[PDB]
């Protein structure tokens, strides 16, 4: 039930400067990186080769190495031929991969952003511009669609290569994907009102429950912030409650998480 994302980031400053850097994710765990100054893709997990042989992995890498060069050349040529007539700088982002649904068929995707906006996808057997994209973009897409070889390769990669590779990843990365890491929590406040803050860090996987409580009564005015990453791929979340002077006494932060085994953290102000 994981989404596998190959995230490519390409910047074209002028005719003589571009770089392309990619990162690859299974769920919220990073499996690969490929920086512009490396010839080869790096594994960021022990299990990033999945169930592929050294030989199968080399052939797949080779295909991407050819791609990176061709993509760079093709974009610059397309821009040179287009509107508003060679328009550096150019920013392109590409998001490709597959969503696994145990029991059924994976769903694949290849989406492309240009100058920060989603404009193009590969759909079925060809490229298409998406509603509201700049109309001129229809022209390079028509051009791209004349390339039968590339369309056959993209269909292979999305329909076959991606779910086969990912299935292997899921099996080979099982222990990391199912790791439990425990939250640790601490309290602070900023100030007649004050905001109590419960900081919760180091948990994995992502799903958590954090509430300010008074005894068994949930304080529903509790506000949870965004999930913020730790360097070690665990998570951080804060939960705040606005209280009046004097109300703090008898409140606690309570956290539930899969890793705790039903033993909640309860920290009383």
């Amino acid at each position: 039930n994981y989404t596998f994302r190959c995230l490519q980031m390409s910047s074209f400053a002028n005719r003589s400067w571009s770089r392309t850097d990619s990162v690859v994710w299974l769920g919220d765990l990073q499996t690969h990186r490929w920086s512009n100054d490396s010839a080869t893709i790096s594994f960021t997990k022990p299990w990033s080769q999945g169930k592929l042989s050294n030989q199968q992995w080399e052939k797949l890498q080779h295909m991407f190495q050819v791609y990176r060069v061709s993509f760079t050349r093709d974009i610059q040529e397309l821009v040179k031929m287009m509107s508003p007539k060679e328009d550096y700088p150019i920013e392109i982002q590409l998001s490709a991969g597959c969503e696994m649904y145990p029991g059924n068929a994976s769903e694949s995707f290849l989406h492309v952003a240009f100058q920060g906006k989603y404009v193009v996808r590969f759909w079925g057997t060809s490229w298409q511009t998406v509603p509201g994209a700049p109309s001129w973009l229809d022209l390079p897409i028509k051009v791209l669609n004349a390339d039968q070889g590339t369309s056959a390769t993209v269909q292979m990669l999305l329909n076959d290569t991606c779910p086969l590779f990912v299935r292997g990843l899921l099996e080979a990365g099982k222990s990391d994907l199912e790791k439990q890491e425990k939250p640790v929590a601490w309290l602070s406040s900023v100030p007649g009102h004050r905001q109590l803050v419960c900081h919760v860090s180091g948990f994995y996987p992502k799903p958590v429950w954090v509430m300010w409580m008074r005894g068994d009564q949930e304080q529903q005015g509790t506000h949870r912030g965004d999930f913020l990453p730790n360097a070690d791929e665990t998570w951080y979340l804060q939960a705040t409650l606005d209280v009046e002077a004097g109300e703090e006494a008898g409140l606690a932060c309570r956290v539930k998480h899969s890793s705790l085994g039903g033993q909640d953290i309860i920290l009383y102000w």
Partner: protein, 98 residues
């Protein structure tokens, strides 16, 4: 063009005198070209590590910097970000709590 947002927070409960890791999570900026420093008493910390830049489902970029630090009652910590969307570097101070 989009302005970076900056959150600064600790890996473990900040206790004065105890080695910890301070994070600076920078998001929502565009274009991806960015410079990020973490500061102790206004001075660049040379041991800052940078995760790989990535982007979210909604196309916005993000990156995480982090550094070993020992919080104390006399040291301030900050993350300073330079980006074409801002005339000045944006500096956000650790709130000493996060």
């Amino acid at each position: 063009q989009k302005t970076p947002q900056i959150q600064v927070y600790s890996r473990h409960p900040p206790e004065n005198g105890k080695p910890n890791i301070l994070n600076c999570y920078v998001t929502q900026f565009h274009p991806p070209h960015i410079e990020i420093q973490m500061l102790k008493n206004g001075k660049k910390i040379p041991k800052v590590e940078m995760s790989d830049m990535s982007f979210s489902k909604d196309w916005s970029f993000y990156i995480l910097a982090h550094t070993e630090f020992t919080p104390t009652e006399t040291d301030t910590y900050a993350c300073r970000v330079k980006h074409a969307s801002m005339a000045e570097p944006k500096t956000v101070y650790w709130d000493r709590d996060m």
